[PDB]
Structure formats: C-alpha cells, structure tokens
Design a protein around this ligand. Structure first.
Ligand code: MG
Ligand code: ZN
Lengths: 194, 75, 65, 449, 390, 194, 48, 56, 76, 97
C-alpha cells in the first residue's frame, strides 16, 4: 500500500476488530501507521491531509488542496476546533486488550491510500527440481517456466568469506550440471569411450 | 639528512647469514617466497645493500608496538 | 461501482441513504444538516457517503453475454 | 541491520542445503547468533532499532511507574521465567503498589554485571561529574547514595541492578550497544540471544501499551521563537546584501581564493549556513523533551535535529555540487528575477519551512536540490560495485595458515603475522587488541565483592 | 606492591603478549594501584584474565581474511558521497574526497587530481607567524601574469603592456626590480622596459604580425620566486605549531628548502613518496591516506583490512594498482586472470607461452567444482577404524 | 522586434513566430520552426494586466474561448528564446512597472501525476517524486471498457472513492471520474511492533 | 519526453534540472533508477 | 583436544553426521525422532568424538 | 570469442554463477515474536522444497508417519 | 470506446503503440563549446536536409589557425582553403565575410 505523499509499506499484520483501539468518540481505526516514519521522511503534507480529511468529512464538503492556492492549515485547525474536536487533531483512545485508556492522546484522521499492483500472490516463486536449459542444462529463468533463483558471483564471494567450502560446492555444482568424464593419463585429452 | 629519520620510514637492517638461515628455516621458505625490495630503493642505497641479502624492517604498528618485516633485495 | 452496503469502519448500514443524500444536497440543502438528519454522526460513516462516486451507470453499456 | 532490509516491498531468497556436510556447515558457521559482532569495526550489528530504543527510554525514564497488572503482564509477555514479584518501590494513593521501570529492566540482566558510561541524552555535565566522583572514590558506593544522585545521562549498573540512567541507543543499539557487547563478550552468544529476545519484547510491550504518537502540533513553536527566527533570517539577508554591494563597488578584499566571485560565493554560503545553524539552535531550545518527536530524535531511534529544524524553522540553502543554483537563463535561474541579481533568495536560499509552506520559486529550487541527491545515489551504486569487484578479485584467496602467516597462492609471504597483531578484528574490542581497563575493573569488582 | 614487582609479574606471566599490551597494562596497573590498594593475588588474577582474553582473541587458522578485508572496504563504499563539498572555503585547499579519492588511491594513478602537500616547519619559523610566511614565500610559486592586476597584449605597437598590482609584491615580499632581473636572467633579446608598475617586452620576432601574441604569452607565463609546480600556500596554526599547505606537488625538491622540517613533511602523491622515501614508506602513506578518508567521511573501518590491502599492493617493491595491469595481472593462474577481464587475449597469450595452471586458487577450484582451499577446505581428518559402540 | 511583437499581438501574422534580441552581440533571432516547447502568459502593459474582469466573466459565460483570448492580444505563448527578454510577475498583486508578463497559474508547472499530491509544497522533494511515480501504479477503474477489452494484464478496484482532499486540477482533467483509491481512517501509534 | 543519451554514463550535467524547464517540464515526475533525469514529462501548461 | 577452531568443529560434525546417515551406529543414546545432524551435535557436546584432526 | 567473454558470456555468469535448485523468493514481513535466529516460512513453500533424510534407527517412526501423511497434508 | 479516451496512439497487430517524443539538439544553429584537452575552440552545426544530418565544425587550435571538419573528409582542412574551394578566391572577400 502507498499514500500520495510517498509513504509505502506492506501489510504487517491483520488484527481483529475487537483488538483495535477506539477513540472516545467511537471511531475505530481502519489502518495504523508507525510514528517513526514521519520524521526523516519530512512529509508534513500527510499530516495536513489527515487533518483536512476529517474536517471535510465532519463538515460535509470536500476540501481544496491545490498546490499554492489551497486552504491554509490554520483555517482547517480552526474549523476542526469549531466542530468539537481538539485543534491538534489528537483524540483519546482506549486499548483494545486491556480496555483502559492510553496515557497519551493519539493523532487520528482520514488519509487517502492506494493499493499498488505489487501483490504477493504474483511474486512468490518456488523451485524444487524443475526443467533445465539445453546448452548449459542449468535451471531455466523466470517464474512462468518454473525457473530457479540466481546465485551470482557476489553470493559466491560471500560464501567464500564465511569459509564454507562444502556449502559452496553443494550450492554450485552438486545440484546442477553433474558430469563424469574419462581422460587418458599421458595426453590429458578427453578419452573417447566406445 | 638521511631518509631513516622520517616518521613514515621505519628502521632497516641487513641480516647476516646465520639469522638468514634461521629465518628461512622458521617459516619453511626459500629465498623466492619473501617480499621483494628493489636495488635502486633509497633505503637499500642508504644501507649499502647487495641483491641476495634480506632486509629486516622494524615496523611501528598501531595494533602492535613492534613488528618485524623481512624483504629480499632484487635489481 | 455502486454504493457500499455498510460503512467500512463501524458497519452501520448506509447503503439505502446515498440517493436521498444526493437529492437533498443537490436541491440546495446544507450537506452537514442533511447528513445529521440521516442519522450519520461519526465521521467514518459520513466519509463513505461524501466521497462515493457512482460508476455502475457508465460501465453498464458494455455487455459481454 | 545486517540484511539492510525494510518492509516496504523488499524480496529475499531462501536456500535449502541438501547434504549433511552442508547442513552442518550452515548450522555451525552461519548461525545468526554467531554474527552479532560485526567484522568491520568489532562492534555489535544485530541490535535494537526504532521502537526498541524508544520503548526502552519510555520504560526506564525518570518518573515512570507501573502497576501490579502491568508488571506481571509485561514480564509474562517478554518470556521471563519469574515466579514472585519483587518488593514494591513506591506506594501511591489508595494503597496500590507501584514498581519503577528500572527494577523491571534489571530483572532481565545477569546477576554479576557492572558498567557505567555516558549516553546521548546527557545535557548537564555537572551531574555526571558528581556521579563519576562518587563512583571513583570507592568502586562500590552505597546504592542509596547513587539513587539520591541519579540522573538520566549516566547509566550505572551494579550487580545487575539499574541504579541510575535511561535506556538509549548506547545501551543495545545498532552501532554502540555497550550492554549487548559486554554480554556477548563475557557470557556467550546464547546469553546474548536470550537477552535480546527478552528486551525487544519488553520494550515493544511498553511502547504499545503506554501509547506513542506524533502529530501536526509536534512543530508548533511559540510566538517568541518565530519572531527570533524571522529576525535571524532578516539579519542574514541584510549581511548578504551588504557583501554584494561591497563587491559591486569593488572594495571587496580578495581571499586566498583565486577569483573574487568565488570569494563572494564562499562568504555568502558561510553566512547562510551560520544563519540556518542559529535558527536550528533556537528551534531546538524551544522544544522540550515531552515532545515525542524530540524523544525519537535525541535517543537516536529515528531522524536527527536537522529534520526538526527543517520542518520547524526553515529549509535553508539549496545547492548543487557545492555551488549555489546558477543554471538557467542568462544571469538568472528563473525569469521572475532581474538579471544580475545575486541576492540570497534569488540563488536558492529558502526562508520558509515545510510546516509554513513554500512559495513556487522555493519549490523549484528545492526540486533542483533533490534531483542531485537522486542522481548521486544512482551513480554511486555502480561506482562502488565496480570497485568492490576489483578488490574482491585482487584479494580473493589470501588465508591464514597454521603458523599464523598469510601466504599468497604461489607461496609468497604477504604478512608474517596477520594484522601485525594476530587478533581477528571481529573478536577485537572495537579495534583494540584487548580492553585492559574493562578487565581490571571487572576482576577488581568481582573479587572485592 | 612495588612497581618493580609489578613489572616482574608482568614479564613472568604475560610472555606472549604484544609490546603495546604490556606497556598499557603496566601503566593502568600503576594508576589503579596508586588510586586503590592492590594485593599480589589481585594483580596475578588480572594478568591471568588478560592472558586468557588475548589467547581467546587470536585469529582462527584457515580464516579467509582477504575476502573479509575486501568486503569491509567495499560495503561502506556505497555510503560516502561521490560528490564532496567542492568548496575549499577559507584557509583550505579543495581536495577530492569520498569515493573518487579512494578509487584514485587504490588504482595508484601516477598523479592525483589535487596534489596537496603538507610542510611541517622546523624548530625555527614554527612559532613565528612572520617566519612562517618567510618559509611560505621560500616555497610559494607565482607566475608573471599572476603578479599583474591587468595585462594588455598590445598588438598595435607589438609590445607588452602590463599593469602590476602592489598586492602580489606585498604578499610575496618581492620588488619590481627583482621581477625585472628575473626576466632578464630568464629571457634574452627582449626589451623588458622597467617602469613603476609597467613592463614592456618587444623582441625582434615580435615586431612582425605573425609572431607577437604567442611569444608575449610565453614570456608572461614564466614563474619566478617559486619552487616548481607549487601554487598557493596557505598557512595555519594547528595546536601551537604553524603548518604549510601547497597546491601542486614536488616532494623531491621541497625537502632541501631551508626552514622545512624533513621529518614530518608528507605529501599525498604515493608514487612521489615511493621514489623519494621507498616502498615501505609508501605502504604507511597508503594506510594513512585511506584511514584519513574513512575517518573524515564518518565511517568506521578497522585498520587490519587496510593493512592487508597496503601489504598486498606493495609486494614487489613497486606500488602496483589492483586493476588488470597490477596485482591481478601478476596472478600465476591463467583461468583466474581470464575470469576477471580481457579473457581472450590472456587465453591466447597463455597458449603461446605454454603456461601451466596449478589450480591453487579459489576461482579455478570453483570452476572445476573442487573444494576451495580456505576455511573447512583445508581441514584434514583421520579416525581409528575399530569403533566400539559402547 | 517591437514592430513584430505588435503585429503578432494584433493578429497580422501567426502566433508561432517568436522574436528575441540580444543587446550584447547585437543579434535578432526569429523562430518559426517545429518542436519548440512554449507556455502561455498574460501580457502586462504599463503595469496593468490586459486581462480584465469582464474578460473573465465572458469566459465563464461561454461567450469567449481560449483561442479568442490568444487572438485578442491578451495572452501570448513564449518559448525559451523570447522568455530571455521577459520579466514575469508571479502573482497579480506583485505587478509593477518593469514587469512585462503575469503568470497564469503557478500550480500548473507540475506534471499530470504530480498534481495528485495535495499540499505538495509541504513535502520533501524525494517524497513528492516517489508519490508522483507511485500514482501510476495504483489500482482503480482506469477505463470503462475493462469488461470487453483484451489486455495481457489488468486490475479493477471494487469500491473506488474520490479523494476527500483533492486539488482542483484533477476535477478539470477528469481524474475524479476514474478514481484509483480509497479513504482510510488512519491512526498513528506503535502496535505490537508489527 | 525522453533523451537519446546513453543511460550507463553519469551525464551529471544532462540529468540536472535546468532553470528554463519552468513551465515546460515537470520538476518532480521522473524515474527512480538509471533513467533519473533522462526521462521527463511535459508540464500541464505546455504547448508544442 | 587442545582447542577446536570453528572450521574443525564444523568439519568433524559434518563427517560424523554423514557417517551416521550412511549406516554407522551411534555411540550415545539419543531421543527418538532426531535428525542425524542433531544426533551429531549431541554426540559432540557429550564429548565422545571418534574423529581426530591432523595439524601440519 | 563473444560466447566466452562478457557478463552473460561463458566464463562469468555461467560457471561463476548459475540458477540453482531448492530455492524460493517472496516478500518479507516483520514478526517480533520469533527468535532472532528463526525465519517464518509459508506452509506452501515447505510443501515444495524438500530435505532428503536417510532412514536410521532413531527416526524410523517419524519418517514412517510422515510418509503415511502423503504429499498433501503438511508433515508429509 | 470509452468517451474519456484521449487517443493519440497507434494500433499495430492489435497492440497499442505510442511514440515518445525525442529531445534533440536544435538544427541549423551554431553552438560554441570548449575543448580544453586539445585547447581547441569548436563550433558545431547539425545541418538538416531531406532527413540527412551533417556535423560541420570549424575549430581554432593553439596555433591560431582555423580548420574545418566536413563529413567524409578524413582530416580537417584549413578554413580559407575550403573557403576558396567555394569560389570567393580573393583574400579581401574572406576578410569581409
Ligand atoms: Mg526497500
Ligand atoms: Zn461508520
């Protein structure tokens, strides 16, 4: 999921309704975001939109948010104050499990979120044996044709750095392109079996 | 002025034959396995060295106070 | 496509109130008073009626049998 | 932190070894708990991040107290196998027991642990000096005196009891987790794993059930701060204009910088940077530690003071490649300014903040600023990759032999003793061969106790 | 106990400890013994614990230190800013920083992008600012056109018209007749008409139309009073000692300039240090330069990896690059070199020379699918057959 | 150049001709070729914008069109060459004597997807770039022909919603008839560390 | 709008935001990877 | 023994696990349902090891 | 000549690295309730990826039961 | 068809192909650039006629002599040489031009 202000993320956990907190005015959040994502991302526009969404929903009219001529923030805060809510946009909620109110009042509003098309049902991929190519006889490439994942050179250097020689052999040679060849002991040319 | 007084230049010393054999036997090496130092190197010229000898270098490492490094002289 | 049956957050049935709200607000009534009259009080419900767009009418033309 | 991964759409690969030798190598060499200490600098890498540090601060801050039910619930949630609660610390009204956060945290520590240091939250050096004098006088001062002279800013642990301090990034953080490093060096990887698995859950419970949020009013400065910031900006602009006029009259003194214009630009940039720093100083001064964003920034959980001063006071000066914005029309970046203008605003200085909104010209200047960072990362990745490939191919197959020497494949002796010392950097004490002071203090406290 | 007893106990038990460990242990033991009373048993236990820790901290045989060092140098490389400040500011000279500086150091370019030297002053002229600019002027290099405030290559009369400012002579301590005699000594058959703030040059070949501007510019280009290849000279006091910094670099010649302290004089040109001081000094120069860059950018990298890199780079008495023309080019294995770069040419060259690959590296064993000779690949095991289940 | 400007504004010649002069080198440039990128601007004469209130009223009533304003000498297109001689005033109240043009709408300097972000001047530039790029990946009723179209891949969002806080541009460009997201009730707090 | 230059090279000067783009090229909409600064979109008030 | 490096311990455990899988008897009683590898780790931890390591 | 050389050539990208069997890839989601040395694996991946186990005396019962479970129940 | 569909794209073999606009240098215009490696001051023009492009450059080297680069000409020719080759042989004519 992603918002219009650049905040992106994946669903981390799905929570039953009775375990969700609820504000003192009877609102149960649809979605919870982490407070650590706001600073170092510096997207005050998201907070302004959060205030504006609840102001618009309470007032029954949509809110202009044009680039430079939109409704100023102070007007939105004053209007929110006039409707019976705190100007800061914060509210008092009670914890879902314990059932007693949290020590701090919490920020809550309405924000526009979009579902992206990078969905896990189209990204999961597994390969146990599968088919192989022709020239190299290595596993194919691509999810559609039951391909295998790529174990590049960097992974080889990582495995060397750990010092796991037999693990390197197992990941590289044992499970792909095993071969047996006869060779004469004076030329070294590949001996031709009959 | 000599280059041995610079802070970046560690001490150098020409090893004699007995400790040459002792060092060559300690690490199970021959003369070809040691690091090489050119004949025209200013340190070699200052020491008056000769290709064939090995120079003992006393390093000043931050991790260890004294560390000995050996180099063989080539042209 | 069409108006949802229940509010996504709390679950109050608001499916039948969209057309009345649209007609009343189009007539000239203040939308806030109309929403208050319909019974919707928490803003989670009001959002669903306010931000809804009717798209079933302009996709009904293309039929597939 | 090891994988450098974030849960914003990242994907990871999983490999299943098939042979018994491969399984044994994976189990013995590459277990996660074996790589807590980084081999790059000899410090911890697998440590707490974000909510762990913030919840630690919330739990062990001064004035934090917890009831019976909260204590039992959080102890069970963490997984600690306690059986009887300790004696209550303070009795509140209505005769209900209360436990300080320090006791709950100390329940998670080993029995024999003693360490003291200064964390990032220190702001009054006098208190730390007094505490250090008390500790240094005799190495085991009476606990009651230390509780009397407690101060968030001097973490002090005595035989597993947290006597004074607040959990910070220096406790079990990603970079300088002193407590985690000490545990993993003195007890073992299993003990460090258990300690981490307990503290993470406990801090998560604290931050979840105490409440932690940030909002639009986290940057609401009072009127006095805004007036001061406006005064600073106006003074800086006046100084820049005076410098420009002096340059125009030709009275400007050429700096050791070769070109007079370059001297002018350097002076202007120095003035603007100082102005932004002063504005940041006053903005930080007027925001206390009750603000959640300030808590997150100070403890090192997330962000830094620059983000606060840019969201609260002003963005500052935008530049590309270390120079003010100059590309555009002849003698002007945008057509909305007169040609030949060198003023602060006309070349990129943004006097607004993210909270107060940016005028369109400031918006364009900021976009021009950010494009440079984007392309910088895009090119830096490839350059670093090529360099790493060359280095890896150069130094791939050097190894430590059984006699301590490092030898090339043909047999040349690269080093007669690895690292000049023979000590693995991973096992070193933050780059030191051995921490003598810590060993002396530990032994002295152990036997004399 | 007595300090001599402490020394005897340190020497008797800590036999295998490094020198720095012994010295630091002695100092800390003295301090903690004077601060707090210590018994003999306590000191013995402390030394035993130190010995145990040192033994436990030793490297494990078979560790692949080279790959670890390469990754430790390369992983932070994705973090420094390829675009540095590019602004010297005041009392500084701009120098390439971040990734480009590290790349230049590693590739061992014959000449760096911003050659900057460091000239520590001798006992005299160090505490005296005036003597500091005396030394600077002894090494500061300025050209004829640098002195002048304005210059007009007059083609109407086919002579030189130049307006010299007093500022350059004020800073450099020079005089008009000094420049005059320098021009007389440097060039002949030129007028060199001496004036207050003007010089007129009108050689015979400049009388015609086709041979004036080039010769006039060439004469105007000449540098005087300066050591070759040295630009501006910033002087700043660090601690209680003034130091000099120069644009450009000539390390061979500066060391003979009076007033310079040759002991602490350093430069950022590693090849220059190698030619003047030797390969062993170039090793320390490389280590110090990389450490300075890493510390400046705020990334912490252990010294041992840089030690390994520097030791490998100076294995043959020459500071070779790590690229295809350097350390990699010296690998005996043909397949290892072929895998890196320029495969076909290396293969054909090996075929011509009839070289032999002994397969003693990681890459070849990986290609053939045999155990690599690092880590678990070097362990050899035996066992007694008549196993008793018990 | 004054003569050519007067002829262009009167309507004697086409509006694709652009003239710019360079005083330093004494050169006059006339451009009538293909592929120049231009923007419209309101012509300011003697410190008075040529677009008056009754013109706006006529445009609103439908009696007047954009092409009529172009042909009336009220609005002229400027390319990168002619803009070298201009001194544009950003806002209507900032028009002074030396100004020669007035900006029409500063919020239109942004591209089509970048206009989706409400209050875009309150965000850091990289976050705005990420949001603009991600606005092209969200699901929604993109086109009404999805039932009978034949594309390799396609997504449909069951209950799209108009954003509560929206810029006035996307109502004009038609985005609000094909929305691509929903309005969530968002709370900002840490929950179980998930 | 796309540029014909090769993406592999840095092209530090080409990828930057010129001052003449005001009103002709969107300052924000641009790809993330190697195409950053070489692929651009017309502003709303543009007229070829 | 004197001291077992990480690589030597890994090698010994791998060899013992392979031998146990191929049919060698286990010299220590083990819980039911354990994999051969974890049986090897239990055997090593008990201290009964039949494989010695050769040093240069 | 071009077959051997290059990133996609024979020498590098074909022997140095290659596609591998017994591997999977999917997105990552946080979970603080497991130990730091554990990974949550989808049940679907477990049914596909396999580990060959030799039947010995101490694991005959478990392996027999899991064979009885077949390839459609999880512990199979 | 969707009435909101804007058009402006082609259909080729049942797939919708769109032509992205290329950003090229302005044709038949002189642009002067700096070449400090060879200390040559170069002006370039991309002349267009019937789809054919012609990179014609006149440059001044350190010697102060003007040379002209022409397509299919292996090496630069002296400026007044090619100027004479276009008629206009009298030196006063070049001086005036
Ligand atoms: Mg990510
Ligand atoms: Zn509701």
């Amino acid at each position: 999921f992603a918002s219009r202000h650049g905040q992106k993320g994946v669903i981390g956990l799905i929570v039953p309704q009775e375990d969700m907190p609820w504000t003192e005015s009877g609102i149960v959040p649809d979605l919870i975001v982490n407070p650590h994502g706001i600073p170092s991302r510096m997207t005050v526009g998201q907070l302004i939109e959060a205030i504006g969404g609840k102001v618009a929903s309470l007032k029954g009219r949509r809110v202009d948010g044009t680039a430079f001529i939109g409704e100023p923030e102070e007007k939105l805060r004053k209007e929110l104050e006039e409707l019976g809510f705190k100007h800061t946009g914060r509210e008092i909620m009670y914890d879902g499990i314990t059932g007693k109110r949290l020590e701090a009042d919490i920020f809550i509003g309405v924000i526009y979120y979009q579902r992206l098309h990078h969905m896990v049902a189209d990204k999961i991929h597994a390969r146990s044996r599968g088919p192989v190519q022709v020239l190299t006889k290595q596993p194919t490439e691509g999810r559609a044709r039951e391909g295998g994942l790529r174990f590049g050179e960097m992974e080889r250097d990582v495995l060397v750095g750990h010092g796991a020689a037999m693990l390197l052999i197992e990941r590289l040679l044992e499970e792909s392109d095993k071969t047996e060849v006869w060779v004469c002991e004076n030329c070294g040319h590949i001996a031709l079996e009959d | 002025f000599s280059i041995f007084d610079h802070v970046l230049v560690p001490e150098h010393r020409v090893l004699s034959e007995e400790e040459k054999k002792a060092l060559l036997e300690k690490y199970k090496i021959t003369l070809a396995q040691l690091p090489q130092i050119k004949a025209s190197d200013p340190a070699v010229k200052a020491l008056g060295a000769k290709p064939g000898d090995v120079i003992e270098i006393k390093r000043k490492s931050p991790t260890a106070g004294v560390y000995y490094y050996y180099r063989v002289v080539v042209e | 496509m069409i108006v949802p049956v229940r509010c996504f957050t709390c679950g109050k049935v608001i499916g039948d109130k969209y057309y009345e709200f649209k007609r009343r607000v189009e007539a000239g009534e203040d939308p806030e008073k109309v929403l208050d009259d319909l019974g919707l009080e928490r803003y989670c419900c009001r959002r669903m009626l306010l931000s809804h767009v009717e798209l079933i009418d302009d996709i009904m033309h293309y039929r597939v049998y | 932190p090891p994988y450098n991964a974030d849960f914003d759409g990242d994907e990871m690969n999983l490999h299943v070894p098939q042979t018994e030798e491969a399984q044994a190598e994976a189990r013995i060499l590459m277990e996660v708990q074996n790589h807590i200490i980084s081999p790059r600098y000899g410090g911890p890498i697998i440590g707490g991040i974000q909510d762990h540090i913030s919840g630690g601060y919330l739990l062990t801050r001064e004035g934090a107290y917890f009831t019976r039910d909260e204590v039992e619930q959080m102890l069970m949630f963490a997984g600690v196998d306690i059986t009887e609660l300790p004696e209550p610390d303070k009795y509140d009204e209505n005769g209900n027991p209360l436990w300080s956060g320090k006791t709950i945290f100390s329940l998670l520590l080993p029995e024999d642990l003693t360490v003291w240091y200064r964390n990032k939250l220190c702001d009054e050096p006098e208190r730390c000096e007094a505490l250090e004098k008390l500790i240094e006088e005799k190495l085991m001062p009476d606990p009651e005196e230390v509780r009397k002279l407690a101060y968030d800013g001097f973490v002090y642990i005595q035989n597993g009891k947290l006597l004074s301090g607040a959990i910070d990034k220096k406790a079990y953080g990603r970079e300088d987790g002193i407590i985690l490093d000490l545990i993993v060096r003195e007890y073992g990887v299993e003990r460090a794993r258990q300690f981490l698995d307990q503290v993470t859950k406990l801090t998560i419970w604290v931050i979840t059930h105490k409440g932690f949020t940030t909002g639009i009013d986290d940057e609401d400065l009072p009127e006095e701060a805004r007036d001061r910031i406006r005064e600073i900006i106006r003074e800086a602009e006046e100084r820049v204009n005076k410098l420009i006029e002096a340059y125009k009259r030709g009275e400007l003194e050429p700096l050791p910088g070769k070109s007079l214009e370059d001297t002018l630009e350097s002076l202007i940039m120095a003035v603007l940077a100082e102005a932004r720093d002063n504005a940041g100083a006053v903005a930080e001064k007027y925001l206390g530690m009750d603000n959640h964003t300030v808590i997150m920034a100070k403890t090192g959980a997330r962000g830094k003071i620059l983000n606060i001063t840019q969201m609260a006071a002003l963005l500052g000066q935008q530049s590309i490649r270390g120079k003010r914005l100059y590309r555009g029309f002849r003698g002007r970046v945008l057509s909305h300014f007169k040609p030949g203008d060198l003023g602060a605003r006309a070349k990129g200085f943004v006097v607004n903040s993210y909270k107060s909104g940016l005028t369109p010209q400031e918006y364009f200047f900021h976009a021009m600023g950010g494009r440079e960072g984007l392309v910088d990362t895009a090119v830096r990745t490839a350059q670093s990759g090529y360099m790493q490939r060359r280095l890896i191919n150069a130094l791939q197959d050097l190894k430590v032999e059984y006699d301590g020497t490092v030898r090339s494949p043909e047999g040349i002796i690269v080093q007669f003793k690895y690292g000049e010392d023979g000590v693995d950097p991973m096992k070193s004490w933050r780059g030191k061969t051995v921490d003598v002071d810590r060993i002396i203090v530990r032994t002295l406290l152990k036997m004399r106790g | 106990v007595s300090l001599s007893t402490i020394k005897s106990l340190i020497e008797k038990k800590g036999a295998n400890l490094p020198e720095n460990v012994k010295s630091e242990l002695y100092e800390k033991l003295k301090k903690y013994n004077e601060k707090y009373k210590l018994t003999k048993a306590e000191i013995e236990a402390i030394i035993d614990d130190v010995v145990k820790e040192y033994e436990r901290a030793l490297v494990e045989p078979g560790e692949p230190v080279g790959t670890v060092a390469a990754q430790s140098i390369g992983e932070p490389s994705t973090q420094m800013t390829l675009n540095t400040f590019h602004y010297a500011g005041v009392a500084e000279i701009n120098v390439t920083l971040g990734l480009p500086r590290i790349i230049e150091i590693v590739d061992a370019r014959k000449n760096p992008s911003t050659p900057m030297m460091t000239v520590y002053l001798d006992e005299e002229h160090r505490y005296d600012r005036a003597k500091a600019e005396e030394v600077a002027r002894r090494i500061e290099g300025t050209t004829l056109e640098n002195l002048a405030r304005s210059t007009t290559l007059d083609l109407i009369n086919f002579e030189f018209i130049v307006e010299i400012d007093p500022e350059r002579l004020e800073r450099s301590g020079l005089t008009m007749e000094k420049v005059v005699k320098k021009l007389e000594s440097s060039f002949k058959s030129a007028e060199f008409e001496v004036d207050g703030y003007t010089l007129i040059v009108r050689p015979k070949k400049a009388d015609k139309i086709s041979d004036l501007r080039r010769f006039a510019e060439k004469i105007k280009k000449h540098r005087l009073k300066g050591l070759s290849g040295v630009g501006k000279t910033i002087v700043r006091k660090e601690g209680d000692e003034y130091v000099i910094y120069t644009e450009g670099s000539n390390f061979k010649q500066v060391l003979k300039v009076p007033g310079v302290d040759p002991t602490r004089t350093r430069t950022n040109n590693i090849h220059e240090i190698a030619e003047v001081l030797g390969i062993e000094a170039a090793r320390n120069a490389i280590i110090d330069e990389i450490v300075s860059t890493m510390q400046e950018q705020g990334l912490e990298v252990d010294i041992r990896h840089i030690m390994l890199v520097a030791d490998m780079m100076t294995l043959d008495g020459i500071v070779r690059p790590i690229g295809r023309h350097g350390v990699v080019g010296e690998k005996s294995s043909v397949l290892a070199r072929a895998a890196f770069e320029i495969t076909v040419q290396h293969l054909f060259e090996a075929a011509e020379k009839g070289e032999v690959d002994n397969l003693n590296g990681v890459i070849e064993n990986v290609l053939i699918g045999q155990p690599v000779p690092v880590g678990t690949g070097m362990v050899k095991l035996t066992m007694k057959l008549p196993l008793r289940p018990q | 150049v004054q003569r050519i400007r007067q002829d262009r504004r009167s309507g004697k010649i086409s509006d694709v001709i652009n003239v710019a002069y360079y005083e330093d080198v004494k050169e006059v440039y006339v451009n009538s070729d293909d592929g120049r990128v231009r923007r419209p601007l309101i012509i300011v004469e003697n410190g008075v914008p040529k677009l008056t209130k009754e013109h706006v009223q006529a445009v609103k009533e439908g009696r007047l069109k954009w092409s009529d304003l172009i042909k009336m000498g009220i609005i002229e297109y400027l390319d990168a060459e002619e803009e070298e001689n201009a001194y544009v005033a950003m806002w209507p109240w900032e028009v002074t004597e030396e100004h020669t043009h007035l900006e029409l709408m500063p919020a239109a300097i942004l591209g089509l997807p970048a206009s989706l972000v409400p209050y875009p001047e309150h965000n850091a530039a990289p976050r705005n770039t990420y949001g603009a790029g991600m606005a092209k990946q969200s699901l929604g009723l993109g086109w009404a022909n999805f039932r009978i179209r034949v594309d390799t891949r396609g997504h449909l969002l069951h209950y799209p919603q108009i954003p509560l806080v929206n810029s006035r541009i996307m109502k004009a460009v038609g985005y609000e008839d094909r929305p691509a997201g929903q309005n969530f009730v968002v709370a900002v707090l840490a929950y179980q560390g998930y | 709008v796309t540029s014909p230059l090769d993406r592999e090279q840095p092209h530090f000067e080409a990828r930057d935001l010129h001052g003449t783009h005001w009103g002709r090229i969107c300052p924000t909409e641009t790809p993330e990877g190697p195409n950053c600064g070489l692929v651009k979109n017309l502003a709303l008030m543009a007229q070829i | 023994m004197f001291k077992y490096t990480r690589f030597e311990k890994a090698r010994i455990i791998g060899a013992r696990a392979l031998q146990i899988s191929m049919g060698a008897p286990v010299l220590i009683d083990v819980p039911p349902g354990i994999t051969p590898l974890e049986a090897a780790i239990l055997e090593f931890e008990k201290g009964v090891i039949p494989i010695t390591v050769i040093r240069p | 000549a071009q077959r051997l050389k290059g990133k996609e050539g024979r020498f590098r990208g074909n022997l140095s690295g290659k596609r591998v069997n017994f591997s999977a890839r999917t997105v990552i989601s946080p979970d603080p309730m497991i130990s730091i040395n554990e990974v949550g694996v989808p049940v679907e991946v477990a049914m596909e990826l396999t580990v060959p186990e030799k039947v010995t005396e101490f694991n005959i019962e478990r392996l027999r039961k899991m064979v009885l479970n077949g390839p459609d129940k999880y512990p199979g | 068809e969707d009435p909101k569909d804007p058009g402006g794209y082609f259909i080729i073999n049942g797939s919708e192909r769109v032509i992205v606009s290329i950003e090229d240098i302005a044709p038949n215009r002189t642009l002067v650039e700096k070449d400090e490696r060879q200390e040559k001051y170069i002006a370039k023009v991309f002349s267009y006629r019937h789809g054919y492009r012609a990179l014609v450059a006149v440059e001044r080297r350190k010697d102060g002599i003007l040379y002209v680069d022409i397509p299919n000409v292996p090496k630069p020719v002296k400026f007044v040489y090619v100027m004479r080759a276009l008629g206009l042989e009298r030196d006063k004519d070049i001086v005036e031009a």
